[PDB]
């Protein structure tokens, strides 16, 4: 009978759809490798799927993936034990050294462009005439980190143009250089910022932009990652 | 075995409870304590499944049903055969669901990512815990819980519907249903949205965020955005289970009568309750 | 901690245009206001909207099915706008009756309104079907949300079209009123054996279950990761960063397995058409093939 028929036909779909979408996943992060980088004996079921190639806007080239994976950067951990799936332990500051929650990834050392190929984020001083339309103005105020010691204080907000949102504020420290802070890692208040991730003494070692009015894809991830390891390593420092 | 990208974020720390003891993974699962906790409370729960199943006197997966207390021993204790063994289960399924979340807690810890995930989840823990333990408890006895059996439990929630007559009535279950409708149509948007950008006519360069607002303007004079819309699925699913509680929690305690009848405080406002014509005059 | 539910700061710039590309920017309106409220949450932009020919179509076919509707209400309130409102929910445009078949032929009282309700409601969804491929032929986009649109208008089709069609009268398709419709739902399932024994009402529940499920799975995931950009999907598909990273690993540590940037967005897409793909095959196959479901699983056959 019929209906008897389209039920079987379609478990026959699903299990091509889902043969289909779990090789789609595939395209980053494979194959496997055992811990020390070397490609691992079990890849499992599903094969890698055949390349395909993205045209990026604005001359940046192309993407083919799967393609050839590498850090291209290098990774301060040792293992802390002789089998394998133990944690590795940082070898140096792992702030610094960029791992753990700390971890940032080499993204193109060039800014994210809008579709017109203008540079997606700006300083609000740079960017014709955007201003804050509604809640606190954070511009001005006093930055304290989870020790409750004053850091430095907001020099300005970083907004995306084409999405009207406020991604970063810059702060100005004790000697007059500046840093990006996420907006998605601080609370306004009414009187100042408030920033849990960082203690005062770890603003210093955010990771530096290289021009004063843009930041690139590798900028953002080494900033955005300083921050969120401030979680973990600025712990003894963060009081309650 | 490793994603090409892993080793980096397999450090010590963010553990909740017995420091380095457990901070370790079985292949790509990590462990930790609440791993070790869902494991206990999941094999414990399957044996007793096991042993509802020898007394029951069948194997067949479509059969096995283990029930709750009848109503006549209220908010007791049963015997193992007849409500005891639902009860213990119940205990382990619960030290399972929440041992999970509180193991996606650690997980978040070491990748110092946010905990809106294991947050998300609890609205699922919540919505199971109305159903097995709220509601029973303020109708005073564990025999209004569902079975656990795959027919016998949309049996249950078609005999729990007709009590109270059409359960389309439920004005919560209305607003429930509108959540997990808006939800579906909301996620069918965004998937084809991100698609339609990433995979453009063939020979085109890869589309931008400013293409995707672009379409939706055009389409309906509005936009969300990037953010806006990620914050309007995580509301619109926490919300569809948040009144999927609620419809249940007020069923059989503060309204007990047919859902359609609830209807009338509307029709009997005194200003048009009198007036001929239309279908109630 | 902040958790990025609500914009702590909303900044405002020049009204944006939008991507010109083949679009005929005579048929776009100009902007509308910014609404701060809707600021806290997304975009504060209202407009500009694209309307040309199939827009004004849609919209006018649109505003005649639900004025036609309008109309039989007010008439069986007896032009009363007390009883208006008392019975709203209450009142119903029904189909013709049995006798009628699937002729034309039926008086507006008893079910010619109804068949001119539905061709306008015909015409309108049609239409908006074909602005929404053409609006994204229009910016060099794929057909990814046409396509999904397709899906949703399958199960409409199957309930007020082919089904009616199948069964050889109008008289099978759905009533327009509040009340009515959810009668008609519960009724066709007591008429048809119980419909959770029809296999396809059961994969569409796991899919609208499981569209609630992904959405809070990967809504919260991008939120948790949106301190490192993680809602820039796109430039993060082109360019993995440390967001796409976390994402990834959080779910390959919870459940042994994970997603990409672009390959969670085709199990998005695939869970939420497979509700109405799976679901209008079930509602075809009741009253055509299968009179009863309890039987029909009974034989599985
Ligand atoms: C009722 C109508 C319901 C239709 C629902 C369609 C969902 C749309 C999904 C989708 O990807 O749409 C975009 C997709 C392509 O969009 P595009 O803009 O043309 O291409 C842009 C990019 O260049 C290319 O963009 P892309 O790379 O995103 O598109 C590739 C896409 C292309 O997808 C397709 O080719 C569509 C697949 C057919 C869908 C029909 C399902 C029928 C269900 C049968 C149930 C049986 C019951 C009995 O690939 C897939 O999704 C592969 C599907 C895997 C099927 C597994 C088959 C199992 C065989 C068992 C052995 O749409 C279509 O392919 C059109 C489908 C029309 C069908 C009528
Ligand atoms: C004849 C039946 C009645 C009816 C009677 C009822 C009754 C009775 C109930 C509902 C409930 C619901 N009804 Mg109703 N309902 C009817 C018709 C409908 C129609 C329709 C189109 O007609 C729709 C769309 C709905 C929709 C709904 C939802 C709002 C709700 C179910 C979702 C939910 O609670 O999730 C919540 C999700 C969960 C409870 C899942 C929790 C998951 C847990 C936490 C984890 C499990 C892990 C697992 C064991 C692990 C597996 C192992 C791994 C795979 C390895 N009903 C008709 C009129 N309806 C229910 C409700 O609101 O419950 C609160 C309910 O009890
Ligand atoms: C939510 C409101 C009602 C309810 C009303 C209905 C209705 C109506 C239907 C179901 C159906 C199902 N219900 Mg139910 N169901 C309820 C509560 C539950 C609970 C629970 C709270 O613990 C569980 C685990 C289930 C599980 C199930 C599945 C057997 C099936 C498809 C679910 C799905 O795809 O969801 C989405 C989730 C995913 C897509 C993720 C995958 C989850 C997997 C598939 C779950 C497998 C569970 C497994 C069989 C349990 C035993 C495993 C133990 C380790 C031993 N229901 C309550 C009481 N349920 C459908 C069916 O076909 O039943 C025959 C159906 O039509
Ligand atoms: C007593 C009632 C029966 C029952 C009878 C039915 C019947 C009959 C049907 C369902 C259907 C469904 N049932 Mg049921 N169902 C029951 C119990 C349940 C329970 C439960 C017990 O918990 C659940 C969770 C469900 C869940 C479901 C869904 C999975 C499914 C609807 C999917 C959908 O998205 O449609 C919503 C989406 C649409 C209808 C698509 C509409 C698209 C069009 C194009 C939109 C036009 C918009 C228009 C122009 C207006 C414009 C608006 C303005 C612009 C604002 N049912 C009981 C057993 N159920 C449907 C199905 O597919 O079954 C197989 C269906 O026909
Ligand atoms: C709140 C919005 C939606 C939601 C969200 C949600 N669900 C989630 C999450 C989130 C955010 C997770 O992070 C978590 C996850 O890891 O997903 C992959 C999860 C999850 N949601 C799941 C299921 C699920 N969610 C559902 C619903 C929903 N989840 C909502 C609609 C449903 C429905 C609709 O029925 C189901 C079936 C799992 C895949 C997973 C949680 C896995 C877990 O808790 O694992 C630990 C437990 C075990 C390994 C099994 C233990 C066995 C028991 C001891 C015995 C069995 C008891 C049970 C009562 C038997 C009853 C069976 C019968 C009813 C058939
Ligand atoms: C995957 C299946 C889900 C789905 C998908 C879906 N719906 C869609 C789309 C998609 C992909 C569109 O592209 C299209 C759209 O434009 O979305 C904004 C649409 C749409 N789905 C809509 C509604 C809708 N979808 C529903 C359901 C669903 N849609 C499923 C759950 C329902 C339910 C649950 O019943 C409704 C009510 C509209 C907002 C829109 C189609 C607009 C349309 O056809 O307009 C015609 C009428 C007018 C222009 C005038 C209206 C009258 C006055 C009130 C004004
Ligand atoms: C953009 O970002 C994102 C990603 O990546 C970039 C993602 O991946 C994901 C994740 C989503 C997907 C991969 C898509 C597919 C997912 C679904 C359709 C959801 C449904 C999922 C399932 C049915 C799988 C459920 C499986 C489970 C829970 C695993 C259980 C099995 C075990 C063997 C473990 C159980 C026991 C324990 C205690 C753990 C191990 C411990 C010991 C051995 C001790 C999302 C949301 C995302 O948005
Ligand atoms: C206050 O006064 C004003 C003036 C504003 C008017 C008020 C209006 C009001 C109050 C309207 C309210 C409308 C409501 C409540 C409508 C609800 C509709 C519902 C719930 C509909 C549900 C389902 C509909 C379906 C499934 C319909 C499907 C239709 C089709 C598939 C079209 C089929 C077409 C047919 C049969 C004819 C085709 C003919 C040809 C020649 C091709
Ligand atoms: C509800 C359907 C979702 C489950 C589909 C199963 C997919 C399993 C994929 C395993 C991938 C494992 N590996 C080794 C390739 O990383
Ligand atoms: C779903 C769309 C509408 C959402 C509107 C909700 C308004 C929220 C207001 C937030 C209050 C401002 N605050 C204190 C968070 O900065
Ligand atoms: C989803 C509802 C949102 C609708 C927003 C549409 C805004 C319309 C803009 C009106 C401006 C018209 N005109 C010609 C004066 O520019
Ligand atoms: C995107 C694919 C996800 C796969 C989810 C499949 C869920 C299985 C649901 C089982 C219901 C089967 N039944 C009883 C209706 O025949
Ligand atoms: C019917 C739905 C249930 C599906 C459960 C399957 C979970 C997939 C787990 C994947 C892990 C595979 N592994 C260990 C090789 O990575
Ligand atoms: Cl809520
Ligand atoms: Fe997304």
């Known amino acids: 009978d019929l209906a008897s028929l389209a039920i079987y036909s379609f478990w026959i779909f699903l299990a091509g759809l889902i043969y289909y979408l779990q090789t789609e996943n595939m395209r980053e992060g494979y194959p496997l490798e055992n811990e020390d980088g070397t490609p691992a004996a079990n890849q499992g079921p599903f094969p890698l799927p055949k390349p395909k190639t993205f045209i990026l806007p604005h001359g940046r080239g192309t993407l083919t993936v799967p393609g050839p994976e590498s850090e291209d950067r290098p990774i301060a951990l040792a293992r802390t034990a002789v089998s394998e799936g133990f944690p590795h332990a940082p070898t140096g500051d792992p702030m610094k050294d960029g791992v753990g929650p700390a971890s940032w990834v080499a993204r193109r050392d060039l800014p994210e462009l809008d579709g017109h190929g203008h540079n997606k984020i700006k300083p609000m001083k740079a960017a014709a005439g955007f201003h804050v339309s509604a809640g606190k103005n954070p511009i001005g105020l006093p930055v304290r980190g989870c020790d409750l010691e004053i850091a430095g204080k907001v020099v300005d907000i970083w907004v995306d143009i084409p999405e009207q949102m406020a991604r970063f504020l810059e702060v100005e420290l004790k000697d007059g250089s500046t840093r990006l802070l996420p907006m998605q890692m601080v609370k306004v208040q009414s009187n100042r910022v408030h920033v849990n991730a960082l203690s005062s003494d770890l603003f210093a070692g955010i990771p530096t932009i290289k021009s004063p009015t843009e930041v690139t894809l590798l900028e953002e991830d080494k900033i955005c990652g300083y921050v969120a390891g401030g979680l973990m390593y600025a712990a003894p420092k963060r009081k309650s | 075995a490793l994603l090409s990208f892993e080793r980096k974020y397999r450090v010590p720390g963010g553990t909740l409870v017995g420091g380095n003891l457990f901070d370790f993974w079985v292949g790509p699962f990590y462990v930790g304590f609440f791993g070790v906790a869902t494991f206990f409370f999941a094999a414990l729960g399957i044996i007793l499944i096991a042993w509802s199943a020898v007394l029951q006197g069948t194997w067949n997966p479509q059969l096995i049903s283990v029930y709750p207390p009848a109503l006549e021993y209220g908010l007791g204790g049963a015997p193992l055969a007849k409500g005891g063994l639902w009860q213990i289960i119940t205990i382990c399924a619960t030290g399972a669901f929440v041992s999970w979340a509180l193991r996606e807690v650690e997980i978040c810890r070491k990748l110092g990512i946010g905990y809106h995930i294991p947050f998300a989840f609890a609205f699922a823990i919540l919505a199971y815990l109305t159903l097995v333990l709220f509601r029973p408890v303020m109708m005073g006895a564990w025999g209004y819980a569902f079975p656990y059996g795959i027919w016998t439990h949309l049996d249950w929630v078609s005999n729990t519907g007709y009590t109270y007559g059409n359960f389309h009535y439920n004005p919560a279950h209305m607003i429930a249903i509108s959540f997990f409708f808006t939800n579906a149509l909301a996620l069918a948007l965004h998937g084809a949205l991100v698609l339609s950008a990433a995979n453009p006519e063939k020979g085109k360069e890869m589309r931008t965020p400013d293409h995707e607002d672009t379409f939706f303007r055009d389409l309906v004079g509005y936009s969300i955005g990037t953010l806006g819309i990620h914050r309007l699925g995580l509301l619109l699913s926490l919300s569809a289970v948040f009144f999927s509680a609620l419809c249940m929690i007020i069923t059989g305690t503060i309204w007990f009568d047919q859902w359609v009848d609830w209807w009338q405080w509307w029709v009997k406002l005194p200003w048009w309750a009198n007036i001929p014509g239309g279908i109630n005059g | ?301």
């Open chain 3, 1 to 301: 901690e902040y958790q990025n539910i609500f914009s702590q700061v909303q900044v405002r710039g020049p009204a944006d245009l939008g991507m010109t590309e083949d679009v005929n920017l005579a048929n776009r309106s100009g902007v509308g206001p910014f609404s701060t409220l809707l600021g806290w949450f997304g975009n504060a932009q209202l407009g500009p909207i694209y309307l040309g020919s199939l827009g004004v179509l849609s919209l006018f076919s649109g505003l005649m099915w639900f004025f036609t509707i309008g109309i039989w209400f007010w008439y069986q309130a007896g032009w009363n706008p007390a009883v208006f409102l008392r019975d709203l929910f209450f009142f119903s445009l029904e189909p013709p009756a049995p006798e009628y078949g699937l002729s034309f032929a039926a008086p507006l009282k008893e079910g010619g309104l109804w068949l001119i309700a539905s061709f306008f409601m015909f015409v309108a969804v049609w239409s908006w079907w074909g602005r929404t491929y053409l609006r994204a032929q229009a910016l060099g986009m794929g057909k990814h949300t046409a396509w999904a649109f397709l899906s949703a208008i399958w199960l409409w089709m199957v309930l007020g079209f082919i089904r009616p069609i199948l069964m050889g009268s109008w008289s099978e398709a759905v009533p327009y009123g509040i009340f009515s419709h959810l009668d008609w739902t519960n009724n066709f399932s007591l008429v048809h054996g119980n419909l959770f024994y029809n296999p396809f009402h059961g994969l569409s529940i796991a899919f609208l279950y499981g569209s609630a499920l992904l959405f809070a799975m990967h809504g919260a995931t991008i939120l948790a990761v949106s301190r490192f950009g993680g809602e820039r999907e796109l430039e993060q598909i082109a360019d993995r960063g440390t967001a796409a990273e976390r994402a990834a690993l959080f779910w390959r540590w919870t459940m042994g397995f994970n997603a990409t940037m672009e390959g969670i967005h085709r199990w998005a897409i695939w869970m939420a058409v497979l509700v109405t793909l799976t679901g209008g095959i079930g509602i075809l196959l009741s009253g055509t093939v299968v009179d009863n479901w309890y039987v029909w699983g009974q034989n599985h056959g």
